[PDB]
Design an enzyme around this catalytic site. Structure first.
Site, short mmCIF file in Angstrom:
data_model
loop_
_atom_site.label_atom_id
_atom_site.label_comp_id
_atom_site.label_asym_id
_atom_site.label_seq_id
_atom_site.Cartn_x
_atom_site.Cartn_y
_atom_site.Cartn_z
N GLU A 22 0.84 -1.19 0.00
CA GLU A 22 0.00 0.00 0.00
C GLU A 22 0.87 1.25 0.00
O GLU A 22 0.61 2.22 0.70
CB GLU A 22 -0.95 0.00 1.19
CG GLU A 22 -2.00 -1.07 1.14
CD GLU A 22 -3.12 -0.69 0.21
OE1 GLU A 22 -3.28 0.53 -0.04
OE2 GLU A 22 -3.85 -1.58 -0.25
N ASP A 23 1.96 1.18 -0.78
CA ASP A 23 2.92 2.25 -1.04
C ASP A 23 3.93 2.40 0.11
O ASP A 23 4.79 3.27 0.03
CB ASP A 23 2.24 3.60 -1.30
CG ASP A 23 3.13 4.58 -2.02
OD1 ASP A 23 4.28 4.23 -2.33
OD2 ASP A 23 2.66 5.71 -2.29
N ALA A 24 3.87 1.56 1.14
CA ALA A 24 4.65 1.80 2.35
C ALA A 24 6.14 1.58 2.09
O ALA A 24 6.56 1.14 1.02
CB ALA A 24 4.14 0.91 3.48
#
Ligand SMILES: [Zn+2]
Lengths: 49, 47, 193, 96, 302, 222, 207, 49, 49, 42, 82, 98
Positions: L84-86
Site C-alpha cells: 500500500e505504497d509503504a
C-alpha cells in the site's frame, strides 16, 4: 461571444467587442461594444462601480 | 400531613406523588428546556 | 501506532497514507458480545451490494503465491517444516496441540515436497475435527497459455482438501468469488476462513 | 422523446416490447403501477450497468417496492418526507 | 386563520355545510377509514343544508359503528385534506351564514397587522393592539368547536403568549439572557405606558406612543425568538443552524472511551486482531464485575 | 494527464431518510416499523447476497455435500420442522396452470421445509436432469452413497437454512448498497449518465427527464 | 387516410378482450376477429360503414355477481349529456348492471357529474379510445392481475393479522384499475414475474 | 492494437514466469496489460475529453 | 496586510479580495514558486467547467 | 492522535467538549442490526 | 393484546442471527453477576465464553419473546429453538 | 518541474504530484536563520546534493539549499510491511543521522 450579455440587455446579443484601454500611468478601464439585435451598438463602460 | 410538603420558598402543597425515574440523554433534557422556552412542550408518558 | 492487517485495507478502503481512524470500545458485556459475534470482522466477508468478497490478500501475497504454487517448486525437509510452522504459529492462536504433515511427493533420489503439497498440508491443519475435506475445481486468474501451450495448470482442481493441480492467484484467494477461500468460508464456517 | 399515444398507431413494429429511458411519469401514468416498478428496476440496474459495478437486484427490489408504495411513486424529498408518522425523524432530517 | 374569519357572521367565510363535510371526512379518517371518508361525497342536494349535514353526520355515525366491530397512508390523506380545507377557507370573502363581508386585515412581516373598515356597498349588506384580534380568535374558537377540535378541547391562546418561561442558569451561562433583559425592559415600559394611558389630540399622542412601545415589544420578541428580523442568534436559529442540534448533537455526538490514531498495517498479527500500543491499553479501560473464579485475574490486574 | 485531473453525498440522507425502519418482521412480511407492508418474502426472500452466493453453485454443493450435511445439522432440523406438505404442494404449483399459488405465498419458508422459490425449483430440477454426471441416476445402483431425493432434500435444506434473519433493518442496507457505489465513481468516457441520472430517477423522481428515449424492436414483415 | 377503421377494430381486441381479464365469458371468435373479419361483420357501402352497430355485452362465467355487463361505442365526439343519460336506461332495462363507454374526444365535464350520481347501483365505466386500443395486459412489464372474493380477502387478512388499510394501495385512476373494473376496497392479487427468484403474488388494494 | 498484439506477448526479453512485471500485471496484483503496453511499446492517441 | 481592494471603483478588476499571498519560506522551492506563480481568479473557480 | 477516556462536559448540554460518532455511523451500526451496540456507544 | 399459544407458533424455529447474540450477551451478564452456572467449567475465566460453553449444549434458561408487529408474541425456550 | 531527473519519462500525473509535493519539503529554507522571526520553519540537518541531476540545478545555485539526501534504495518484496505504497527505513542508517 458570451450568452451572459443577451440575458441582461435583452435587445442585445451574445455578439460583442471590448477593449481594456489603459492610461500612460497604467490605469486601465474597459468599455464593451454590445451589438444589439436591432442593429445599433451600445457603448458600455463602468464608473463608480 | 405526611403527604403534604412545602417549597423552597415555603409554599405548602400536596399531591404529585406518581413519580418515577427514567434514563435518558441529557441533551434531550436541554431540548425540552429550550422548547419550554417556546411554550411548546411534550407530555411524555411512561408505564 | 495502531497496527492492523492488510486484508482490512480493502474493506475500509483506506490508502494507508496517514488517514486516521476512530477506535471504539463497548462498555457493557452485551454490546461487546454483540460486536464479537455479529459484526466481528470475520463475519464481514461478503459485501452487501453483491456477494463479491472484498477482504482478502493483496499484491505481495498473490504474487508470491503464484510463484510458490508453480509446480516447478521443491522443498527439502528443512524448508517444508520451517514454512509450515511459520504459517501455522498455532500458539499465538491456541486451540491446537501438535502439527501434522504429509509424506513427500517424491522420495528418491531425495525427498522433496512441492508447494502444492504445502497448501494441501496447511489446509489439512485447519480441517475441522469432523468436516469432510474440500473438493473443488475453479478457473485460475492467469490464463493457462502462459505456462505452456496446452498447459495443464489452467484452473485449480483439488479434492478432499488436497491441492492437486492449478496455481493459486488473486482469483483463487482474495477479493474473488468461487476461488479457494470463498468455498472455505462457505464450508468450514467463517471463523476458519 | 416519448409519445406512447403515437407508437400505438404503427403496426410495423411489435407494440409489446418497448424499452424506455424512464420518464417514469408517463410509463407509470399510462401503463399501470407494476410497469413502473419493473421499469425503474431495470433502469437503475442499467444505471449501474454502465459501470463495472453489480448491485444485487434485491436492494433494487426494495427501493422499487417502496418508492411505488402509495400507488404512485414518491420522490425522496419534501413530499415523501412530509408523510412519515414519526414526528422525530421529520424533526431531525431536513428542517427542525 | 384570522383572514378566514367572519367577524359579523362570527364564523368562517365558508358555508357551514362544507365545514361539516370536512368535519365528517376527518372524523371518519380518524378511525382508519379512507375510501369511506371519501364516500361521504356521494350525497347530493339553512334547512336543506342542515338536512344534508344530518345525512353526512349520520353516515359517519353508521360507518363508525361498523368499523368499531395509524399509518403513513392515513396521515398522508389527512394532511392533503387539511391543505385543501385551508386553501378553501382562505378563499371565501363574503359570509354564507352571515351573508356579510367581514372587514379584511392586512399583515406585515415586521409583526404589524390591520386594515381599513368596510365598504359602503358592502355596508348595504394598518396596525393596532393585539387584544382585539386575540379576543376575535378566542370568540371563533369557542364558537366553532367541533371542527377545530378535529383539527388540533381548548384552543384559545395557541397563537399568543401571555407570559413566557425562563430557563435555569444551567442552560444559560450570554446573548439569550441579554435578550430577556431587553424584553423585560420592554414589558416594564409597556406596563408604565399603559398606566399612563389609563390615567391619561391627547388620544393621538398617547395611542402613538402606546402602539410604538407595543410594536417595540413585539419586535423585541420577534428578535429574541428569530434573528432574521431586527438587523444575534434566535432559538430557531440555533436549532436549524445545521451546525447545532439534531445533527451535531443528537445523531452525531462526541463520546467517551474512543481513541483516534493514525494506522500502519502489519502482516504478523491477524486479520482479526488489531495490534495496539500499550499507551491505549492503559488509557482505555472498561468495567467488570468480579466473581469468585475470575477473582485472581482481577486481583492481579489491581 | 491534467485533464484526467480536473475531471476527478447528499443522497445518503435521502435514501436513508424514508428507509430507516424497513425491518424484517418475524412473520417474514417485511414492513417499515409503522405497520404497513412493503414486501412479502423480501426481495425474493432467500436472502441478501451473503448466504445466497452458492445457491447457484449446484455443482460444488453436489461435489462433497458431506461437510455440508453436517454443517446444516440435519438430525436437529428435521425434528421440529415440516417438510412434506410444501414439498408436495410444490409439485402441484409447478403444474403451470394457475390456482396453484407459489408455496412461499401459501406456506411460510421458515418452517415448512418444502417451500422455496419457483425459479429455484426450475433450476434445481433442470440441473438434476441435464448433467447429473455426479449424481448417480439404475436407481438400484444409487443406494450406496447418493440419491436423487438426497440432493433434492439437501437443496431444499440449504434454501430453508439460508433465509433472512427476521429482524434485519434492510432499508439502510440498500441505502448503503446504492450510496457507496454511487459516489464510488462519477467520471465519463447523448444520454445523461452517472449521478445526475440516478438523481433524477430516484431523488426527485420527476416528469420531464433530460434524455427521454424509447426503443421498439421491429418485426419480420418490415 | 382511412386508418380510423383499423383503430376502431383494434379497440375491440382490447374490449372483447376485456371480458375475461374480468371474469365474464366470450366466444373465442370475438377474440380472434381478424382485420377483414371486423370489416366483413360491420360493413356496407362504405368504407366508413362501421358505426351504429359497435355495441356488445357479456355475462359472468361465475354465474353470479349480479348482473351482467354491456359494452357500447358512442361514435359522436364529446357525447355530452344528450347522449350520455340516454345510454343508461338501456343498461337499466336490459338489467345490465355495468356499462362500458368509449368516446373520442373530450367528454365534457359538465356532462359527467350529473351522470356520476345516477350511476348509483350501476357503474358507467369509463374508458375512451385512442388511449385504450391495445391490451396493456399484453406486455412484458405488467404482472398478472387477479381479483379476489371477500372469502379470499378475509383469508389474506386473517393470515397476516392486518387491518384493511395496512396493505399497498392502487389509486383509482390507474389504467389497469379501471381496466380490471375495480371498486374502492377490493384486494388485487398481482403475480410478479420478478426473475431473481421465481414469480410470486403480491397484494394491493384500491381506495 | 496491432503492434501491441505483436510485441507484448513475446517481443520482450524474458518469458512469462520469470518476468516479474508480467507477473504483477497478469496475476491481478497491480497494473494491467495496458500499463506494460504504454511503458514498453507506445502511448497511442491521447483522447482528451 | 489584507489584500482587500477597497476602492470606490473596482479599477476594472473582477475580484476584489485575496490579492496578496504571504511569502511562505517553508522551503526554497515553495519560495520561488510563490514568486513566479500566476492565477486567474476564483470568479472562475466558483465555475466548475 | 487524541485519546479521550473522559474529560470536561459542555456548559449547556454536558457533552464532552471540543470524538465524532454519528449521523453516518448510525447508518452503519443499524445496518449491522446491532441495537445494543448503538444505544451503548451513543 | 394476546400471548400466542405454544401450539400455534409461526415464527421461525431457527435461532436467528440476532437472537444468539443477545442471548449470550445476557447470559454473560448473569454469570458475571454471580449467577449459578449449569455447565462444568474447564478452568474458564472469561464470564462470557462460559456462556458459549453453556449454549453449545443448550443447557440454558432465559426463554425469549418474539413480538409480532400486530401485538402478539411468542415465548420460545432456548432449548426449543434450533 | 525542470529540476527533475529524466522528467520526460514518468506518466505526467506523477510529475504533477512531484511539483506539488516537492514544494512541501523539509529542506533548508535558507542560510541566515539566526535572524528569522517566523512562525514555523523547517530545517534538515544532514543534506547533500543528488547524484542524478539536471544541469540547471547547479546553474541556479541550488547547491545552497539541499532538500534531501541520497539513499541506498533496493526494490524488493522482502519484509512484508511495505505494501500500500509503504516503505522501510534501515535502523542503522536512521540512528546514524538520517
Ligand atoms: Zn358574517
Amino acid at each position: 461571444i458570451r450568452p451572459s450579455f443577451a440575458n441582461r440587455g435583452t435587445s442585445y446579443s451574445q455578439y460583442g467587442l471590448s477593449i481594456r484601454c489603459v492610461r500612460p500611468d497604467q490605469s486601465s478601464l474597459t468599455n464593451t461594444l454590445h451589438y444589439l439585435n436591432n442593429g445599433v451598438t451600445m457603448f458600455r463602460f463602468h464608473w463608480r462601480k | 400531613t405526611s403527604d403534604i410538603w412545602q417549597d423552597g420558598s415555603g409554599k405548602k402543597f400536596v399531591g404529585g406523588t406518581n413519580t418515577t425515574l427514567i434514563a435518558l440523554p441529557s441533551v434531550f433534557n436541554y431540548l425540552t428546556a429550550e422548547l419550554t422556552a417556546m411554550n411548546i412542550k411534550m407530555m411524555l408518558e411512561v408505564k | 501506532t495502531i497496527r492492523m492487517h492488510y486484508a482490512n485495507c480493502n474493506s475500509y478502503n483506506a490508502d494507508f497514507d496517514g488517514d486516521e481512524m476512530n477506535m471504539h470500545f463497548p462498555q457493557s458485556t452485551n454490546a461487546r458480545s454483540e460486536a464479537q459475534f455479529i459484526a466481528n470482522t470475520d463475519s464481514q466477508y461478503l459485501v452487501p451490494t453483491s456477494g463479491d468478497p472484498l477482504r482478502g490478500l493483496i499484491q505481495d501475497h498473490v504474487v508470491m503465491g503464484v510463484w510458490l504454487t508453480c509446480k516447478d517448486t521443491f522443498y527439502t525437509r528443512d524448508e517444508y517444516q520451517q514454512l509450515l510452522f511459520q504459517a501455522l504459529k498455532p500458539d499465538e492462536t491456541g486451540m491446537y496441540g501438535r502439527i501434522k504433515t504429509l509424506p513427500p511427493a517424491i522420495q528418491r533420489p531425495g525427498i522433496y515436497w512441492t508447494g502444492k503439497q504445502i497448501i494441501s498440508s496447511v489446509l489439512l491443519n485447519l480441517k475441522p475435527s469432523d468436516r469432510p475435506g474440500l473438493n473443488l475445481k475453479s478457473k485460475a486468474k492467469v490464463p493457462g497459455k502462459y505456462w505452456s501451450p496446452d498447459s495443464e495448470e489452467g484452473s485449480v482442481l483439488f479434492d478432499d482438501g488436497e491441492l492437486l493441480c492449478g496455481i493459486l492467484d488473486k482469483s483463487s484467494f482474495g477479493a474473488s468469488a468461487f476461488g479457494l477461500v470463498h468455498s472455505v468460508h462457505e464450508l468450514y464456517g467463517p471463523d476458519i476462513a | 422523446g416519448v409519445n406512447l399515444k403515437a407508437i400505438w398507431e404503427f403496426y410495423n413494429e411489435i407494440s409489446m416490447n418497448d424499452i424506455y429511458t424512464n420518464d417514469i411519469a408517463a410509463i407509470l401514468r399510462i401503463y399501470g403501477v407494476e410497469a413502473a416498478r419493473n421499469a425503474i428496476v431495470h433502469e437503475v440496474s442499467s444505471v449501474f450497468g454502465v459501470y463495472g459495478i453489480a448491485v444485487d437486484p434485491r436492494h433494487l427490489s426494495l427501493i422499487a417496492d417502496y418508492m411505488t408504495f402509495e400507488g404512485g411513486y414518491k420522490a425522496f424529498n419534501r413530499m415523501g418526507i412530509e408523510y412519515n408518522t414519526s414526528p422525530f425523524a421529520k424533526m431531525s432530517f431536513e428542517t427542525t | 386563520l384570522l383572514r378566514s374569519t367572519c367577524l359579523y357572521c362570527h364564523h368562517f367565510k365558508l358555508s357551514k355545510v362544507k365545514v361539516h363535510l370536512f368535519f365528517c371526512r376527518l372524523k371518519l379518517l380518524d378511525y382508519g377509514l379512507l375510501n369511506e371518508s371519501e364516500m361521504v361525497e356521494n350525497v347530493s342536494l339553512a334547512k336543506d343544508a342542515a338536512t344534508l349535514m344530518r345525512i353526512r353526520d349520520e353516515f359517519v355515525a353508521k360507518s363508525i359503528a361498523d368499523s368499531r366491530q395509524l399509518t403513513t397512508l392515513l396521515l398522508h390523506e389527512r394532511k392533503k385534506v387539511v391543505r385543501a380545507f385551508y386553501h378553501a377557507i382562505s378563499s371565501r370573502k363574503q359570509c354564507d351564514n352571515c351573508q356579510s363581508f367581514s372587514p379584511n386585515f392586512r399583515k406585515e412581516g415586521f409583526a404589524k397587522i390591520f386594515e381599513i373598515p368596510l365598504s359602503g356597498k358592502n355596508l348595504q349588506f394598518k396596525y393596532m393592539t393585539s387584544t382585539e384580534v386575540r379576543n376575535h380568535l378566542r370568540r371563533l374558537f369557542v364558537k366553532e368547536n367541533v371542527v377545530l377540535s378535529r383539527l388540533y378541547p381548548a384552543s384559545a391562546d395557541m397563537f399568543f403568549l401571555q407570559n413566557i418561561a425562563v430557563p435555569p442558569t444551567r442552560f444559560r451561562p450570554n446573548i439569550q439572557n441579554e435578550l430577556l433583559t431587553r424584553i423585560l425592559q420592554s414589558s416594564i415600559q409597556i406596563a408604565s405606558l399603559s398606566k399612563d394611558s389609563t390615567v391619561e389630540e391627547r388620544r393621538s399622542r398617547a395611542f402613538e406612543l402606546l402602539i410604538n412601545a407595543f410594536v417595540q415589544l413585539q419586535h423585541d420578541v420577534n428578535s429574541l425568538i428569530d434573528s432574521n428580523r431586527n438587523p444575534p442568534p434566535g432559538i430557531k436559529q440555533i436549532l436549524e443552524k445545521k451546525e447545532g442540534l439534531f445533527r451535531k448533537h443528537m445523531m452525531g455526538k462526541r463520546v467517551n472511551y474512543a481513541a483516534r490514531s493514525v494506522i500502519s498495517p502489519d502482516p504478523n498479527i491477524e486479520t482479526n486482531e488489531i495490534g495496539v500500543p500499550p499507551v491505549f491499553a492503559t488509557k482505555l479501560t472498561y468495567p467488570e464485575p468480579v466473581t469468585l473464579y475470575n477473582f485472581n485475574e482481577m486481583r492481579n490486574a489491581v | 494527464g491534467r485533464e484526467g485531473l480536473i475531471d476527478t453525498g447528499y443522497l445518503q440522507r435521502c435514501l436513508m431518510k424514508h428507509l430507516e425502519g424497513l425491518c424484517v418482521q418475524y412473520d417474514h412480511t417485511v414492513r417499515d416499523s409503522d405497520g404497513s407492508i412493503v414486501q412479502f418474502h423480501y426481495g425474493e426472500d432467500s436472502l441478501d447476497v451473503t448466504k445466497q452466493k452458492h445457491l447457484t453453485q449446484f455443482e460444488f454443493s453436489a461435489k462433497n455435500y458431506k461437510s455440508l450435511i453436517q454443517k446444516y445439522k440435519v438430525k436437529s432440523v428435521l425434528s421440529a420442522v415440516d417438510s412434506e406438505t410444501a414439498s408436495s404442494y410444490a409439485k402441484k404449483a409447478l403444474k403451470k396452470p394457475y390456482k396453484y399459488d407459489p408455496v412461499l405465498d401459501k406456506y411460510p419458508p421458515s418452517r415448512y421445509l418444502g417451500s422455496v422459490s419457483e425459479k429455484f425449483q426450475r433450476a434445481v430440477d433442470e440441473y438434476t436432469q441435464k448433467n447429473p454426471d455426479k449424481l448417480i441416476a439404475e436407481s438400484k445402483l444409487d443406494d450406496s452413497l447418493l440419491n436423487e431425493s438426497k440432493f433434492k432434500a439437501l437443496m431444499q435444506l440449504r434454501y430453508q437454512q439460508s433465509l433472512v434473519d427476521p429482524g434485519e433493518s434492510v432499508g439502510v442496507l440498500a441505502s448503503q448498497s446504492i450510496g457507496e457505489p454511487s459516489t464510488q465513481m462519477t467520471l465519463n468516457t447523448n444520454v445523461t449518465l452517472g449521478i445526475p441520472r440516478l438523481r433524477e430517477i430516484i431523488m426527485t423522481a420527476s416528469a420531464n427527464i433530460q434524455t427521454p428515449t424509447m426503443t421498439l424492436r421491429l418485426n419480420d414483415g418490415v | 387516410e382511412e386508418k380510423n377503421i383499423v383503430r376502431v377494430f383494434r379497440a375491440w381486441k382490447t374490449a372483447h378482450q376485456l371480458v375475461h381479464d374480468r371474469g365474464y365469458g366470450v366466444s373465442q371468435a370475438e377474440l380472434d376477429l381478424t382485420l377483414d373479419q371486423f370489416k366483413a361483420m360491420h360493413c356496407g357501402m362504405g368504407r366508413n360503414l362501421d358505426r351504429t352497430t359497435l355495441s356488445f355485452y357479456a355475462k359472468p362465467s361465475n354465474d353470479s355477481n349480479k348482473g351482467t355487463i354491456y359494452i357500447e361505442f358512442a361514435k359522436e365526439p364529446s357525447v355530452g349529456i344528450k347522449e350520455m343519460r340516454t345510454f343508461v336506461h338501456t343498461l337499466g332495462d336490459h338489467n345490465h348492471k355495468t356499462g362500458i363507454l368509449i368516446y373520442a374526444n373530450s367528454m365534457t365535464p359538465s356532462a359527467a357529474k350529473i351522470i356520476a350520481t345516477v350511476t348509483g347501483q350501476f357503474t358507467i365505466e369509463t374508458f375512451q379510445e385512442s388511449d385504450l386500443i391495445v391490451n396493456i395486459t399484453h406486455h412484458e412489464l405488467v404482472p398478472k392481475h387477479i381479483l379476489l372474493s371477500p372469502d379470499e380477502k378475509k383469508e389474506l387478512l386473517d393470515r397476516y393479522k392486518l387491518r384493511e388499510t395496512q396493505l399497498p394501495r392502487i389509486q383509482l385512476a390507474d389504467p389497469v384499475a379501471r381496466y380490471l373494473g375495480l371498486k374502492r376496497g377490493e384486494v388485487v392479487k398481482i403475480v410478479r414475474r420478478s426473475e431473481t427468484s421465481g414469480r410470486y403474488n403480491s397484494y394491493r388494494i384500491c381506495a | 492494437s496491432s503492434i501491441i498484439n505483436k510485441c507484448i506477448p513475446d517481443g520482450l526479453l524474458t518469458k512469462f514466469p520469470y518476468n516479474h512485471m508480467q507477473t504483477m500485471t497478469v496475476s491481478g496484483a497491480k497494473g494491467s496489460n495496458v500499463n506494460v503496453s504504454q511503458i514498453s511499446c507506445l502511448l497511442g492517441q491521447q483522447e482528451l475529453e | 496586510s489584507t489584500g482587500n481592494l477597497v476602492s470606490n471603483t473596482g479599477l476594472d478588476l473582477q475580484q476584489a479580495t485575496g490579492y496578496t499571498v504571504v511569502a511562505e519560506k517553508l522551503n526554497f522551492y515553495r519560495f520561488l514558486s510563490h514568486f513566479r506563480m500566476v492565477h486567474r481568479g476564483a470568479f472562475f473557480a466558483e465555475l466548475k467547467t | 492522535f487524541q485519546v479521550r477516556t473522559t474529560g470536561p462536559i459542555h456548559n449547556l448540554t454536558r457533552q464532552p467538549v471540543k470524538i465524532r460518532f454519528g449521523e453516518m455511523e448510525r447508518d452503519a451500526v443499524i445496518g449491522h442490526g446491532t441495537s445494543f451496540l448503538m444505544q451503548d456507544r451513543l | 393484546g394476546k400471548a400466542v399459544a405454544k401450539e400455534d407458533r409461526t415464527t421461525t424455529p431457527y435461532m436467528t442471527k440476532y437472537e444468539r447474540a443477545r442471548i449470550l450477551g445476557t447470559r454473560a451478564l448473569q454469570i458475571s453477576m454471580n449467577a449459578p452456572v449449569l455447565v462444568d467449567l474447564e478452568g474458564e475465566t472469561d464470564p462470557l465464553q462460559i456462556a458459549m460453553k453453556e449454549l453449545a449444549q443448550k443447557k440454558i434458561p432465559l426463554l425469549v419473546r418474539r413480538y409480532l408487529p400486530d401485538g402478539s408474541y411468542e415465548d420460545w425456550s432456548v432449548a426449543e429453538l434450533i | 518541474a525542470n529540476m527533475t531527473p529524466f522528467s520526460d519519462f514518468n506518466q505526467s500525473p506523477r510529475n504533477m504530484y512531484q511539483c506539488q509535493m516537492g514544494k512541501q519539503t523539509m529542506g533548508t529554507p535558507g542560510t541566515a536563520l539566526r535572524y528569522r522571526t517566523d512562525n514555523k520553519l523547517y530545517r534538515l540537518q544532514t543534506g547533500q546534493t543528488p547524484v542524478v541531476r539536471p544541469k540547471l540545478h547547479n546553474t541556479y545555485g541550488l547547491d545552497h539549499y539541499p532538500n534531501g539526501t541520497n539513499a541506498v534504495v533496493a526494490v524488493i518484496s522482502y519484509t512484508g510491511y511495505d505494501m500500500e505504497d509503504a516503505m522501510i527505513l534501515n535502523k542503522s542508517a536512521h540512528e546514524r543521522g538520517f
